[PDB]
C-alpha cells in the first residue's frame, strides 16, 4: 500500500512554501502547472503516489491542503499557473478574513470554530488514501494560523488520527530582529507545547539562520522571502528525494523517523543541505556539509555545554562511487570530524540516490544532511529566555486576557515554560554520559 502524506500549508508562510514546494515537485517530476504530464516525463522512475495523487487522466494532483483564514493567499494560489495542480475540493479557507492576529490562542479557537470543515476535508482526503501514513504540517510556530490554528489542528489530528504520523516543517521566526508581534514568543511556546504533547516530529526551519545564510553564503543583501522559500523548496525536495527516486532501502518514512528521532520527546531534527551556493569525492562532499559555516540552522555552539551530534544522515543524490562513500566514511571517522551523542551509538548514515530525470541539475552531486545535534538546546534555551523576558513585563496582556486561553490566567504559558525547561534539561542530560541511563 502507498504511504500517502497530506501536506497542510498554514498561513501566509506555510501556504507560500507549500505552493513553491509543489511547483518544485512538478518541475522535478515533469508535471505541467495544469497537472498534465510533460512529454519528457513519460519514462520516469519516480513513485508519485507517495506524495502526489494521480488522477484517472494521468494528471498528478498534489496531496496538499492549503488552509488560510484570509482569502488573499488562497486566491493567490488559485490565481497561480499551478492553480490546477491541487484538488480545489480539498481546500478549506475561512471566509472570515480576520485571522488569528498572530495569537496562538486565537488560531486555536478558530481551529475549533472551523473544526468540522477541516476534519471533514482531512477525512475525505484520508479516505482517498489507500494507506495514508500521516500529515506533514508546513507552518510557523510564531504566526497566527500556523501557531494557533496549527495547535488546534494538532489537537484535532491527535484525536482523529491516533494511528497516523504527525510531522511538522516548523519555520522558526528570525530571532535577531525585533518582532512586531511582542507576543510571538507566547504563540511559539504554546505551539511548542502542542508539538511536545501531540506531534511526532518537528523539523525546525530557522528564518534567522536562513537570512544569515542568504547574506553570508548566497551574498543576498536583504534576502527576500522568495529566495528563502526557494531554499526551503530545495530542502523539501531533498527530503522527498528518497520518495521521488525508487531505491532499495529506506523507501518509507517510518525507517527515516526511527533513524532520526531515537527519543520521542527529543524529536527536534536539525537540517543540513548541500550545495548551498549561489550560481568532487563523497568525502569532499561530506566534509563540506560538515563545515559549520554551511549548517542552515542557528544552534548555539556553546563551548561550555558539549553539544554533540545525536545522528547524521547524508542523502547524496547523483553519480556517487560507493567505494568512495566507504573511503569517505573511513576518513571522517579517522578524522573525528563530528562529535556524536555519548549516551548512544553514533548514527551516521549515507544514502545514495539518483536525481530526478525531469529536473536539470547543474551539479552532478548534491547532498542533504539531517542531523540531531544537542546544540539545538541552545535554540530552545533562547526561546525559553525570550518567553520569560516577555512574561516578566506582563506586556500586552490585556488583549490576551480577552482570549479564552488567557482570559482567566496564563497557566498555559507557565506550563509551556515548564515544558521548554524540561526540553532543555533533557538536551542537557543527552549532553551527559548518563543520558542512556537518564
Amino acid at each position: 500500500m502507498p504511504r500517502e502524506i497530506i501536506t497542510l500549508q498554514l498561513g501566509q508562510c506555510g501556504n507560500q512554501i507549500g505552493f513553491e514546494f509543489w511547483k518544485q515537485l512538478c518541475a522535478e517530476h515533469g508535471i505541467s502547472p495544469e497537472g498534465i504530464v510533460e512529454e519528457f516525463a513519460t519514462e520516469g522512475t519516480d513513485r508519485k503516489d507517495v506524495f502526489f495523487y494521480q488522477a484517472d487522466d494521468e494528471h498528478y494532483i498534489p496531496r496538499a491542503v492549503l488552509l488560510d483564514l484570509e482569502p488573499r493567499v488562497i486566491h493567490s494560489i488559485l490565481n497561480s499557473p499551478y492553480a490546477k495542480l491541487y484538488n480545489p475540493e480539498n481546500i478549506y479557507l475561512s471566509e472570515h478574513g480576520g485571522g488569528a492576529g498572530n495569537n496562538w490562542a486565537s488560531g486555536f479557537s478558530q481551529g475549533e470554530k472551523i473544526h468540522e470543515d477541516i476534519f471533514d476535508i482531512i477525512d475525505r482526503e484520508a479516505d482517498g488514501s489507500d494507506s495514508l501514513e500521516g500529515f506533514v504540517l508546513c507552518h510557523s510556530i510564531a504566526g497566527g494560523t500556523g501557531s494557533g490554528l496549527g495547535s488546534y489542528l494538532l489537537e484535532r489530528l491527535n484525536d482523529r488520527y491516533p494511528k497516523k504520523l504527525v510531522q511538522t516543517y516548523s519555520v522558526f521566526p528570525n530571532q535577531d530582529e525585533m518582532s512586531d508581534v511582542v507576543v510571538q514568543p507566547y504563540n511559539s511556546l504554546l505551539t511548542l507545547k502542542r508539538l511536545t504533547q501531540n506531534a511526532d516530529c518537528v523539523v525546525v526551519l530557522d528564518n534567522t539562520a536562513l537570512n544569515r545564510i542568504a547574506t553570508d553564503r548566497l551574498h543576498i543583501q536583504n534576502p527576500s522571502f522568495s529566495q528563502i522559500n526557494q531554499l526551503v523548496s530545495t530542502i523539501m525536495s531533498a527530503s522527498t528525494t528518497t520518495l521521488r527516486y525508487p531505491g532499495y532501502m529506506n523507501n518509507d518514512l517510518i525507517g527515516l523517523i526511527a533513524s532520526l528521532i531515537p527519543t520521542p520527546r527529543l524529536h527536534f531534527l536539525m537540517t543540513g543541505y548541500t550545495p548551498l551556493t549561489t550560481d568532487t569525492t563523497v568525502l569532499d562532499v561530506m566534509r563540506r556539509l560538515l563545515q559549520p559555516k554551511n549548517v542552515m540552522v542557528s544552534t548555539g555552539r556553546d563551548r561550555q555545554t558539549n553539544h554533540c551530534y545525536i545522528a547524521i544522515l547524508n542523502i547524496i543524490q547523483g553519480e556517487v562511487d560507493p567505494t568512495q562513500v566507504h573511503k569517505s566514511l573511513q576518513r571522517i571517522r579517522e578524522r573525528k570530524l563530528a562529535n556524536f551523542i555519548p549516551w548512544g551509538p553514533a548514527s551516521i548514515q549515507v544514502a545514495l540516490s539518483r536525481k530526478s530525470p525531469y529536473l536539470p541539475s547543474a551539479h552532478r552531486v548534491s547532498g542533504l544532511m539531517m542531523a540531531n545535534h544537542t546544540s539545538i538546546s541552545s535554540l530552545f534555551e533562547s526561546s525559553c529566555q525570550q518567553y520569560d523576558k516577555l512574561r516578566k513585563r506582563e506586556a500586552f496582556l490585556e488583549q490576551f486576557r480577552k482570549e479564552d486561553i488567557f482570559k482567566e490566567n496564563f497557566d498555559e504559558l507557565d506550563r509551556s515554560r515548564e515544558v521548554v525547561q524540561e526540553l532543555i534539561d533533557e538536551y542537557h542530560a543527552a549532553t551527559r554520559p548518563d543520558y542512556i541511563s537518564w
Binding site: 566507504h326 566514511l329 573511513q330 571517522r333 556524536f340 551523542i341 548512544g344 551509538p345 553514533a346 551516521i348
Partner: protein, 95 residues
C-alpha cells in the same frame, strides 16, 4: 556474508531473537506482565551474549582474515566506539 556459515548461523539466531522481541512487544501493547518481563530479560541476556560473540568473532576474523566487508560492518557498528566501549555487545544492560 552468506558464505560465512558460522556468521550466517549467528545472524539467523540474532534475526530470530529480534523477531521474538518484536512479537513480544506486538503481543503486549500494554505494560508487560511478569511473564513478558521474564521473556524480555531472557532475550536481553541472549542478545547481549550473542552480540558480544559477534563482535569478538568479527575482531578475530579481522585478525586472521583481512575481510574488507566485515571490517566495514564493524566500523559502521562502532562509528562512535559505542560498541567498543560496550565490549562489542549490542544491549549489554542488565535485565
Amino acid at each position: 556474508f552468506i558464505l560465512l556459515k558460522p556468521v550466517f548461523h549467528c545472524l539467523n539466531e540474532i534475526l530470530d531473537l529480534c523477531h521474538s522481541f518484536c512479537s513480544l512487544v506486538s503481543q503486549n501493547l500494554g505494560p508487560l506482565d511478569e511473564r513478558g518481563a521474564a521473556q524480555l530479560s531472557i532475550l536481553v541476556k541472549g542478545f547481549s551474549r550473542q552480540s558480544s560473540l559477534l563482535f569478538k568473532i568479527l575482531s578475530s576474523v579481522r585478525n586472521h582474515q583481512i575481510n574488507s566487508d566485515l571490517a566495514q560492518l564493524l566500523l559502521r557498528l562502532d562509528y562512535n566506539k559505542y560498541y567498543t566501549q560496550a565490549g562489542g555487545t549490542l544491549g549489554s544492560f542488565g535485565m
